[PDB]
Design a protein around this nucleic acid. Structure first.
Ligand SMILES: [Mg+2]
Lengths: 673, 105
DNA sequence: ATCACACTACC
DNA sequence: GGTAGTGTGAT
């Protein structure tokens, strides 16, 4: 085993210069440094460790270093270099699995300050290196009387960079060992810094293998990108911006502008008693002025106080203004925030009723405005706006944290491609259509690619069936794939309209509340608890399951975590959401091992992964994947293979509920819904 | 004896009137406004022959104040034949007003 | 429930 | 140019 790390002139996307690298070899206990002209040797050293069936440790190497070295090797030495997946270990991938109850700065992309909870020390150090390095640089240049520029700290190799480089392997090596000391994932019997690659995956918890395969495949996905119809969204932006203007005009008329105190420095005191009056707006006492002998054109008279004010124009985006104008129309807020302030979400706006008809009608305009702005914000004006993220290759390379969630789910960001508006919401067709394989023209034939969207069928219920099989012998599972589980649940709970039950179940799984539960049939908010009692009464297995999970955790805890399908620990925040954590984590790991197995099976069939190949992973949104295919035939194969792999996953974990998938072929995300 | 204005009666009551008209742009929440208020009743009564005092509550009449760049209240505007002759901001005193008036009238 | 991110209001 | 509060977008 060897721990390594490199310094280059940029992010993967545009890197062109390999500044330096460092390798720590366990077999010799030494640190060898490689400067600019040692690049060929650096690469030889890594392939050497591969020839001996070794292992190479990097921190965030799966997303950066390995793909980077491939690219830099082809550009600077006209050499082909491809570290095999099975030979690489990523300590970042490892921390996210082991310290899953914690966050991280995504290697510096997120501000530590904004992150909640504590942070693993070594990892924080590693992610702050680019920032610290930039600090020493910027600090040192100024001591030399030179202006600092954007990111010049990375343009040329220097010794401060080499020192930081060595530091990284030092910390990475420490972090690595800290992680290997966790007996839950790595047996104490074995010394994992002294085994071949095939033993390392073999003797460690199944989860280590899965997360590494998941990070590797997903690193590929980010590189693939999701073909995006820029022109389409710009035309949509013009439309949206127009409807926004018109909505502002009609609204800035129905609701006139007003005045508000602002700029007041001194405190207003009763002119008679001096009694400070903080309730009164802050004032300002001019220190000069006077009525004058030439008249004094100036408008202030010393000692004569006034409340400085500003002119505020109604802004439909401000929930405050909205709350101000509607109460002024006779609206009596019912539910306030748990911090002194009326609630103004689409739900309440929906329930507001005022005398003036024009006002009542403006409320819908306000709701439309809020939605329009939501779309504009997400597609064009926001920081992480799609239009601000599309690259030269015409694709959006959204970031994905293979294990950024406690349950084992991934998190997506920059921009979150797991939150594109659905086809069922306003403008969801256009948004969704702008993301598609059709927007990618083949590098050879110039022909549009085709898309394959595959969705794991009712995974949450199947995961529930599975876990209650211990108590009902597969009764629920059997009913799912043969009867009408939705009807069965419709009869369990009362809820008229055996379709309200579907609303009920998915609600019952994703938290929900008595109010919203009863809000399915009618008003019966908290009174709806009665309904959430009849169900669990007519479905004793779910009750048995909950009781058993409790016995596992509570006793003050006996254990603060749950065991996922691959053995890993899954932190349980509150005993109340334990069943939920279990279910989400199951679905999560099932879909992870699934998209992993799918790509492996596609590759074993001959198909190549890439735009220069046959298929390309574009996105993975929890229970679904969207795959770009060069031809319909290939698209048909991916769909068939996604089904085989799902069955394989079910078998692999002796699942007590048959698992399935459904796929649709089409030009984009809209049609593949 | 003070003219209580509105946005719609402004042009005709102030701009299209004979004589000097002193307008007070005020608000219920302002402190200095509530202060210079009593002073105005007297002033309106004293200069009852060579001046008219008019109040405009900017919350009920949100359209007029903006046309004059009001940036603080109370704002006193002196109009002569539909134009702003003199202008002073702040709760002046019974005597400071008298000066401002006598000096500008 | 789990998570990203936008727009207002304030220092 | 940041933090807090309130919300919506999705699985
Ligand atoms: Mg690194």
């Amino acid at each position: 085993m060897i721990v390594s790390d490199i310094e280059a002139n940029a992010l993967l996307e545009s890197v062109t210069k390999f500044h330096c690298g460092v390798i720590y070899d366990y077999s010799t206990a030494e640190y060898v440094s490689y400067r600019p002209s040692d690049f060929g040797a650096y690469l030889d050293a890594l392939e050497a460790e591969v020839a001996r069936g070794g292992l190479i440790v990097f921190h965030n190497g799966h997303k950066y270093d390995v793909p980077a070295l491939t690219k830099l090797a082809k550009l600077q030495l006209n050499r082909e270099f491809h570290l095999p997946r099975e030979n690489c270990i990523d300590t970042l991938v490892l921390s996210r699995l082991i310290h899953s109850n914690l966050k991280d700065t995504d290697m510096g992309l997120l501000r530590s300050g904004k992150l909640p909870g504590a942070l693993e020390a070594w990892g924080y150090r590693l992610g702050e290196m680019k920032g610290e390095y930039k600090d020493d640089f910027k600090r040192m240049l100024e001591e030399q009387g030179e202006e600092y520029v954007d990111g010049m700290e990375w343009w040329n190799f220097n010794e401060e960079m080499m020192d930081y480089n060595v530091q990284d392997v030092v910390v990475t090596k420490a972090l690595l060992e800290k992680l290997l000391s966790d007996k839950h994932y790595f047996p104490p019997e074995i010394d994992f810094t002294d085994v071949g690659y095939t033993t390392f995956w073999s003797e460690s918890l199944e989860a280590v293998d899965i997360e590494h395969r998941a990070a590797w495949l997903l690193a590929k996905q980010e590189r693939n990108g999701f073909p995006f119809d820029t022109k389409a969204i710009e035309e949509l932006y013009v439309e949206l911006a127009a409807r926004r203007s018109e909505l502002l005009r009609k609204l800035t008329e129905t609701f006139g502008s007003w005045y508000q105190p602002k700029g007041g420095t001194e405190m207003f005191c009763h002119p008679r008693t001096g009694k400070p009056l903080p309730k009164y707006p802050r004032i300002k006492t001019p220190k000069v002025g006077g009525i004058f002998c030439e008249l004094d054109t100036r408008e202030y008279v010393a000692g004569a106080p006034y409340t400085p004010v500003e002119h505020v124009v109604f802004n439909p985006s401000s929930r405050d203004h909205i709350q101000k104008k509607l109460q002024e129309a006779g609206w009596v807020p019912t539910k306030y925030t748990d911090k002194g302030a009326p609630v103004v979400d689409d739900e309440v706006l929906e329930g507001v009723r005022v005398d003036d008809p024009e006002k009542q009608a403006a409320i819908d305009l306000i709701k439309e405005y809020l939605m329009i702005q939501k779309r504009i914000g997400q597609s064009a004006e926001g920081d992480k706006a799609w239009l601000r993220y599309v690259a030269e290759d015409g694709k959006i390379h959204g970031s994905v944290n293979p294990n950024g969630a406690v349950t084992g789910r991934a998190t997506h960001a920059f921009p979150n491609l797991a939150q594109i508006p659905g086809v069922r919401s306003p403008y969801g067709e256009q948004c969704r259509a702008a993301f598609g394989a059709e927007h990618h023209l083949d590098g050879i034939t110039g022909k549009p690619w085709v898309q394959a969207g595959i969705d794991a069928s009712g995974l949450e219920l199947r995961c529930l069936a599975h876990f209650m099989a211990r108590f009902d012998n597969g009764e629920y599972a059997h009913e799912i794939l043969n009867g009408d589980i939705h009807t069965k649940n419709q009869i369990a709970a009362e809820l008229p309209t055996r379709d309200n039950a579907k609303t009920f179940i998915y609600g019952f799984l994703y938290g929900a509340g008595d109010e919203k539960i009863g809000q399915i049939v009618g008003a019966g908010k908290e009174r709806g608890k009665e309904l959430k009692k009849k169900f669990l009464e007519n479905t004793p297995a779910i009750a048995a399951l909950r009781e058993s999970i409790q016995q596992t955790l509570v006793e003050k805890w006996k254990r603060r975590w749950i065991k996922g399908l691959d053995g890993r620990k899954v932190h349980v925040r509150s005993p109340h959401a334990a069943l939920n954590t279990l279910l989400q984590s199951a679905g999560a790991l099932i879909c992870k091992l699934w998209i992993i197995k799918t790509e492996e099976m596609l590759v074993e069939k001959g198909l190549k992964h890439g735009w220069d190949g046959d298929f390309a992973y574009m996105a993975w949104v929890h229970d679904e994947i969207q795959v770009g295919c060069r031809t319909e035939e290939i698209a048909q194969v991916v769909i068939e293979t996604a089904q085989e792999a799902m069955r394989w996953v079910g078998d692999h974990w002796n699942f007590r509920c048959l698992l399935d998938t459904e796929g649709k072929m089409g030009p984009n995300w809209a049609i593949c819904h | 004896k003070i003219i209580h204005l509105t946005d719609d009666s402004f042009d005709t009551d102030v701009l299209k009137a004979d004589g000097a008209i002193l307008v007070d742009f005020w608000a219920e929440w302002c402190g200095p406004c509530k202060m210079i208020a009593p002073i105005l009743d007297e002033i309106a009564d004293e200069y009852q022959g060579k001046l008219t005092v008019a109040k405009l509550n900017i919350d009920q009449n949100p359209g007029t104040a903006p046309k004059y760049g009001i940036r603080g209240i109370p704002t006193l505007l002196l109009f002569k034949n539909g134009e702003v002759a003199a202008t002073k901001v702040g709760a002046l005193s019974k005597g400071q007003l008298k000066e401002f008036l006598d000096a500008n009238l």
